[PDB]
Amino acid sequence: VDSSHLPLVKGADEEQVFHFYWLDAYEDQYNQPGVVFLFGKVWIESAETHVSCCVMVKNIERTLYFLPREMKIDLNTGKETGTPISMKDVYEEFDEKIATKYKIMKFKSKPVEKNYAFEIPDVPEKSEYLEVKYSAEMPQLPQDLKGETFSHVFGTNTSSLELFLMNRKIKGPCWLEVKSPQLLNQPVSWCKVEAMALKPDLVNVIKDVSPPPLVVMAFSMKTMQNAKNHQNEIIAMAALVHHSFALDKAAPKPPFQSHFCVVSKPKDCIFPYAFKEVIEKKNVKVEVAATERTLLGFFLAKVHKIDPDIIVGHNIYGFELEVLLQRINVCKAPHWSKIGRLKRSNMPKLGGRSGFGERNATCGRMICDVEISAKELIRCKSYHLSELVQQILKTERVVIPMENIQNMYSESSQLLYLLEHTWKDAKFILQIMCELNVLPLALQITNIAGNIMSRTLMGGRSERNEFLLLHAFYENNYIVPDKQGLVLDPKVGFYDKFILLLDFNSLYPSIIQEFNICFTTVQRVASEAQKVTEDGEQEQIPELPDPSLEMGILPREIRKLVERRKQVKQLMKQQDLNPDLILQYDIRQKALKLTANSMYGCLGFSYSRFYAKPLAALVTYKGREILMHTKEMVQKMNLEVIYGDTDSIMINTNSTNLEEVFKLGNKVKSEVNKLYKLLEIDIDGVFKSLLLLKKKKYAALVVEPTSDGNYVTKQELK
Amino acid sequence: LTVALETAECEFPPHLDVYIEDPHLPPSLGLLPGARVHFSQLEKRVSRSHNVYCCFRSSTYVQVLSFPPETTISVPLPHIYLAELLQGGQSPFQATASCHIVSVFSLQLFWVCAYCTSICRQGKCTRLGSTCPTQTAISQAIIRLLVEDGTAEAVVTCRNHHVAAALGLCPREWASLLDFVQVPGRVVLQFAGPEPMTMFLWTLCTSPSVLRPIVLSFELERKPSKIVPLEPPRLQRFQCGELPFLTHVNPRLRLSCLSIRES
Amino acid sequence: LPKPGTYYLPWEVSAGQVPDGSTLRTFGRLCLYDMIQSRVTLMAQHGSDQHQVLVCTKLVEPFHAQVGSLYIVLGELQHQQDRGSVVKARVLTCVEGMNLPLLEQAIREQRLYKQERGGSQ
Amino acid sequence: RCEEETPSLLWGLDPVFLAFAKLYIRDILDMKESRQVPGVFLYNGHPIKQVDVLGTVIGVRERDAFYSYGVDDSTGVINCICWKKLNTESVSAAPSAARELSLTSQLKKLQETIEQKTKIEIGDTIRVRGSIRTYREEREIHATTYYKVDDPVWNIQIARMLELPTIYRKVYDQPFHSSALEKEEALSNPGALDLPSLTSLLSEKAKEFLMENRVQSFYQQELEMVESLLSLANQPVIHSASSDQVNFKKDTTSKAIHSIFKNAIQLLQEKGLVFQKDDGFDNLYYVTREDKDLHRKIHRIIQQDCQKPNHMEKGCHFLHILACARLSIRPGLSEAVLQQVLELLEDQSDIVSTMEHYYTAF
DNA sequence: TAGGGTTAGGGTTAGGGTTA
């Protein structure tokens, strides 16, 4: 593969342009401000496959939104000078003060208009602002900058990557068209193809081709803790290799093509006699690592030659990532950057409690953790790997303490057994992840949200919701700010007869839809419960926004999601389709339902950038009101409620026949929907004989009816 | 042979090791400590850890200049502040300074085998019998302080009895503590960086009973013979007024302990 | 917050070379403890000259007395009509064995350095 | 002139930034602050973040969770703040063996010693370590640590107030540090001041220009006819040092430029970037980085373990590898060139180094 | 073929304006 030419693809505009599916984005403002790195895959006709390509864009101009004042205000005496405000006056003041004291040479200004409906005060609802475009080379203006004509400026410290991607309306990994290609004299990455892009306007969004296959690598290791200084170390490698894993269907078979292993020895013990002879007799493709530096170099070289894209493992971020980094640093392994894709030497400071440096160093590739995926997918008894295998594969997993490890080095066959155990563990984890199909689900979630692919893998629902809100508000010409439960006590009793349990669906989204809860449609003029100063035990919750008002912004998107879910559930009922299409529909709906769930958590979580306490307080008040209304109207029908929680409520039945339970549940569903059409309840389960013991504990024989009208009593305790 | 140079170019000569193998050269007469000798045409090689030393070859001539003095006299180490080591003008590598302890990083105590140096247990080795013909245990201790004199900051490492001297404990207390810790076998306190003993040491290490003004006689940790200029300034995010800011910083000095006394 | 305490050797304050109401800290050797009237007369030698300073003690009772010992007194000075100069004690500690010449040279050197730094402004 | 404070990006280069400085209390009262970063203070070009004071306590006040202390050091008075560390969840002992009973007794002794040491009354001697904070338009000293000093003879205070002026006169009343040198950023146009420095500067520029074109074979006159290289070489200092002939001023200037270019070329040669060949050409050199055949040969010989037996330890040392490469291909091979070849081979993930100067295959 | 293990490590924040 010659590096002096770029595999440009000719298009309808008779221009040899570059088409690629971007995957990862990187930036470094402290070293090369205004520089954005993009990673992706580009098809090669000569090799009849796709290879990694590097495209980097320079010449990024900052965007500012000055907030003008309606009246002139002196900056030294704080009094009005008696003159009005005009755009020319603002520009002249800016030129003679801001550029003079901040050394600003190049600047582009033009009066613009935007919309503001956030929680930040001292901002008019609608005004004619000014957009100042300048490079990042000059120092950034202070975030709290105030002038005679302008009281604030917006977008002071917004990331260049965000503005770059948002100015082109990009929704996650997608096909792109790259014009005006420039060759690179000195390659800076390990990718096969590197490109030099000069202007941000040379990209257009293409969504007409399915993404190409990627590389998924699964691996694990063994760790030994030194007794003298508690310095952990890594013993053996094991990994399973797949080359062309699909990203648009179920798990292909076979899920792997090859596997390799390498093991070493500690600083005291020695290898068993004739280990090379034993390997030759066994004929197993296992390498012997002479030293820890040797194994590290071999592992990194194998990774670089393979050049993977998706890496997976167990608790990698928690322990394995920093253990590997510490081992690399201590052993002084040359060219540590080969794990990622960029050639770097200044590794970020490890040991960060938040782990920011850990994710920063891992740029260029996709990293997935099985623990977070399992937590966000289903509910399990425990997060331990053996428990997951029991819940899925029903296979015993051996945990070997150091007592057996120390004498494990006695015979070669014992090491063969240990490495076989490690390889089996890797294969089991690979099977567990492939049957789960977490990666296609994450890809669909990213496509729906349009945010960064990598950030989804860490379970950052707040970030994806924030980016979705950013897309929605930018599509509506808005300015965003910068970045830094009731328990019910019903009638007390114990009932050993049948207990019917139900749970509402999307209580908070239903509340938002019914009452049009949105930033642009909710005011903050009340004295109800939440937002007032400390003057007594009385504060302010916003009242119900008027339904006759213009329908809100975020309810529009959640209604669009509901419509798409309804279309999907209408589509799946049709027969004679490929099973992979059915799986795609199911994962798509499930992604939609998780997005609907995360809609509430967008503002529920305290750390939200657009956190709005009044909206959360209103949501809680409406939920409590709905809960009390539902409980009262249910109990008016001579149906005592034994317990309820927000939206999951079970009603005492004191019956035995299952048909009566089903009919009563259907009647309850018919009754509850009358007041709220958008809010509906579902059969969560039926208990044959429920017994109550203490808080968060219950004993019941769960009802699992068959198609013959009968039921099977299965016991569940917690 | 450990020799110290002497030249007019630098008034602080660096130390140097001269290795004389004996497959063909028994030592010549006159080589004694405290005697000035002259050398010529030695073979230089670079160690694995980037050290400089001279090998003694067949093309080497040795000439003795002066005899050792009849009595051995000593000169106290010069007194200096810790700041002058960061200025490239004729800085010494052995000196004494008046400083004050800030905090600790870690503390380690050992009971190793007399032969294989493995961790002992109640007077027996982990690999006893296989590689141990006798039963004897010897204690070791490692500490890592962080001192300050008034114009700089450096990290100091002590070994053996120097940690006991630095903790301000009488020998009876040290012996009692070593006997008490002799039974478990090992105690590692990663008190900083990346059982009643734990709380006792945690209480002791963070009290003014140890953080006292001390007089330190320190030796530069990086041996003067070693050469490795590879240090560009780093960058971190010190913040004081609830407002982070970024600034470059020099690498931290590394020292070694020779003698610690109170004041 | 009070005003700081500047050092002053006994013979200067004995001659009244400080403004009234100033805060000073000096030294000397006790000679008599007038019990009823709460008055302390300490003395300090200077060659063939002996100087006397009167110390009110109304703010440090209870207070043990060590006859014929050195002392350090910190407070404010009030020029009385007939009694002359008396210092209002705020803290009064006892120090023994500390040599005077080191102290005198110490304040002399500190004053010299302060004046030297005062030569640039 | 408006005295500009040193930029915040160079504060850490000072050795004082991380230290506990000793100051007169009047100085810490009267010394100014910094606008770009509030919370830190600037004095005579030396930023200060931590201070250490000693004196006699003359004011005591207590609050809900923090103490108060007014210290005096014969020249001024400042407030002090000492937080009350929470001794929550007092540890309860157990009736273990005699060793644990003795250890608990020692723990109680240590606790009572600390409690006695930290008790403060009016008229004692206190030592304070910490930083500077401004609250309610007044200055205070937060305390990271503090303890009472027992000086019944006034030795430590006399020593302190004798030692401090020496510290000022030797460290504090000095212009500034020496970091990032001065003018070392570029060389203030290629003119510079030292002719060997001019040759050194020309060396990397010529190397970079050769790299940009990916030159495999070059002649010295081909580099000398380059206008940019001449302009970099043609400096006021080099013209003064090129006074060797008068009748041939142009010729002798060309000779001096040829000499400096050859000096840069041999400087590159000593780095192993370019080697030499015996082809009858004086000014012909080849860049070692692009010798693909040499890289393949070295990779093959390393795979064959440089003719070393397989049964011994895999890989070879630098010296044996150098000897094998010299004998197998060219007696004129230079050692820096082979070092560069080995480094480049390691870059392409061709071999692995178990440790320094010892490389093995896979 | 000559040093030991080579590891970078603490790097926040806390509140006045009061008596029997």
> b/e for D339-348, b at 16 or more Cβ within 10 A?
bbbbebbbee
Dump the DSSP string for B9-72: S-SSPPEEEEE---SS-PPPTT--TT--EEEESPEEEE-TTS-EEEE--TT-EEEE--PPPSS-
Rounded-to-integer distance, Cα A87 and Cα A112, Å: 10
Question: CA distances (Å), B146 to each of B140, B143, B149, B256, D19, in order?
Answer: 21, 10, 11, 12, 11
Query: For D338-343, which contacts have Cβ atoms below 8 Å and span 24 or more sequence positions?
Result: D338/D272, D338/D298, D339/D272, D340/D271, D340/D272, D340/D273, D340/D288, D340/D289, D341/D272, D341/D288, D341/D291, D341/D294, D341/D295, D341/D298, D342/D298
Dump the DSSP string for A369-387: EHHHHHHHH---S---HHH
State both tokens at D193: 């001041």
Determine the 3-state secondary structure of A35 from DSSP. coil
CB atoms inside a 10 Å sphere around CB A42 = 24
Question: CA distances (Å), B227 to each of A264, B52, B250, D313, in order?
Answer: 32, 8, 18, 30
Is A71:A155 a contact under the CB 8 Å cutoff?
no
**What's the distance, Cα to Cα, between the start and end of chain B in Å?**
37
The answer, for A306 touching chain D at a CB cutoff of 8 Å, is no
Rounded-to-integer distance, Cα D21 and Cα D130, Å: 10
- Residue A290 phi, psi (nearest 5): -65, -45
CA of A372 and C1' of E8: distance in angstroms?
30
Rounded-to-integer distance, Cα C114 and Cα C119, Å: 9
Within 13 Å and on the Cβ side, how many CA atoms surround A325?
25
CA of A252 and C1' of E19: distance in angstroms?
84
CB atoms inside a 10 Å sphere around CB D212 = 10
**Domain D21-171, what architecture?**
Beta Barrel (2.40)
Nucleotides of E under 7 A from a protein CB: 1-17
Contacts of D16 in chain B (CB under 8 A): 83, 151-152
Rounded-to-integer distance, Cα A311 and Cα A214, Å: 11
Let me know if domain C1-117 sits in CATH 2.40.50.140.
yes
* Contacts of residue A2, Cβ cutoff 8 Å, sequence gap at least 6: none
How long a stretch of residues is chain C? 121
State the burial class of residue A314 (Cβ atoms within 10 Å of its Cβ: 0-12, 13-18, 19+): buried
Task: Provide the angle, in degrees to the nearest 10, between the axes of the packed helices A275-282 and A412-436.
Answer: 50
Token look-up 């689900």 returns: A441
Rounded-to-integer distance, Cα A532 and Cα A514, Å: 26
Which CA-bearing residue is nearest the C1' of E11? B238
The beta strand positions in D188-309, using DSSP E, are 218-219, 274-276, 284-287
Rounded-to-integer distance, Cα A704 and Cα A710, Å: 9
Residue A310: name the closest of A246, A266, A374 by CA.
A246
Rounded-to-integer distance, Cα D346 and Cα D362, Å: 13
Residue D126: name the closest of D274, D25, D238 by CA.
D25
CB atoms inside a 10 Å sphere around CB C1 = 12
* Strands A232-245, A258-263: pairing kind: antiparallel
Is B193 close to A351, i.e. CB distance below 8 A?
yes
Is D352 close to A291, i.e. CB distance below 8 A?
no
Quote the minimal CA–CA distance from B160 to chain A in Å. Answer: 16
Is A326 close to B194, i.e. CB distance below 8 A?
yes
Task: Show which residues on chain C lie within 8 Å of chain D, measured between beta carbons.
Answer: 1-7, 25, 72, 74, 90-93, 95-98, 102-103, 106, 109-110, 113
Dump the DSSP string for B134-201: S--EEEEEEEEEEEE-SS--EEEEEETHHHHHHTT--HHHHHHHHHHHTTT--EEE--S---HHHHHH
Dump the DSSP string for A495-546: --S-EEEEEES-HHHHHHHHHT--TTT------SSSSS-SSSS------PPP
Question: Measured between CB atoms, which of C90, C95, C110 is closest to D153?
Answer: C95
Task: Return left, alpha or beta for A601; rule: phi > 0 is left, psi -120 to 50 is alpha, else beta.
Answer: alpha
Sign of the CA dihedral running A375, A378, A381, A383 = negative
Rounded-to-integer distance, Cα A366 and Cα A354, Å: 19
Which CA-bearing residue is nearest the C1' of E8? B193
DSSP-assigned beta bridge partners for residue A113: A128
CB atoms inside a 10 Å sphere around CB A238 = 24
CA of A337 and C1' of E6: distance in angstroms?
20
Rounded-to-integer distance, Cα A388 and Cα A408, Å: 27
* Contacts of residue D319, Cβ cutoff 8 Å, sequence gap at least 6: none
CB atoms inside a 10 Å sphere around CB B36 = 11
Rounded-to-integer distance, Cα D81 and Cα D67, Å: 6
Quote the Cα angle for B168-B174-B178, to 5°: 145
State the burial class of residue B258 (Cβ atoms within 10 Å of its Cβ: 0-12, 13-18, 19+): middle
Dump the DSSP string for D291-358: -HHHHHHHHHHHHTGGG--SSS-SSEEHHHHHHHHHHHT-TT--HHHHHHHHHHHHHTT--EEEETTE
Quote the minimal CA–CA distance from D232 to chain B in Å. Answer: 28
DSSP 8-state class, residue D181: -
Rounded-to-integer distance, Cα A413 and Cα A705, Å: 52
* Strands B154-159, B253-261: pairing kind: parallel
- Residue A366 phi, psi (nearest 5): -95, 125
Question: Measured between CB atoms, which of D59, D158, D169 is closest to C103?
Answer: D158
Rounded-to-integer distance, Cα D329 and Cα D332, Å: 9
Please indicate the experimental technique that yielded this structure: cryo-EM
* Contacts of residue D54, Cβ cutoff 8 Å, sequence gap at least 6: D71, D73, D125, D126, D127, D128, D149, D156, D157, D160
| Dihedral angle of Cα D346, D352, D355, D356, to the nearest 10 degrees | -20
Q: Which of residues 265-324 of D touch A (CB under 8 A)?
A: 313-314
State both tokens at C112: 């010299």
Q: Residue B2 is inside which H or E element, if any?
A: strand B2-4
The beta strand positions in A264-383, using DSSP E, are 286-288, 310-313, 366-369
Dump the DSSP string for A419-478: HHHHHHHHHHHHHHHHHHTHHHHHHHHHHHH-S-HHHHHTT-HHHHHHHHHHHHHHTTTB
Question: CA distances (Å), A369 to each of A218, A261, A356, A626, C67, in order?
Answer: 11, 21, 16, 39, 81
In chain C, whose CA is at the least distance from the CA of D138?
A: C1
Is A688:A713 a contact under the CB 8 Å cutoff?
yes
**Residue pairs between chains A and B whose CB atoms are closer than 8 Å:** 20
Task: Return left, alpha or beta for D349; rule: phi > 0 is left, psi -120 to 50 is alpha, else beta.
Answer: left
CA of D39 and C1' of E17: distance in angstroms?
26
Single-letter residue type at A686:
V
In sequence order, which ranges of chain C are alpha helices (DSSP H)? 10-14, 100-117
Rounded-to-integer distance, Cα A330 and Cα A150, Å: 54
- Residue A356 phi, psi (nearest 5): -65, -45
DSSP 8-state class, residue A336: G
State both tokens at D21: 């400085």
Is B102:B82 a contact under the CB 8 Å cutoff?
no
DSSP 8-state class, residue B130: T
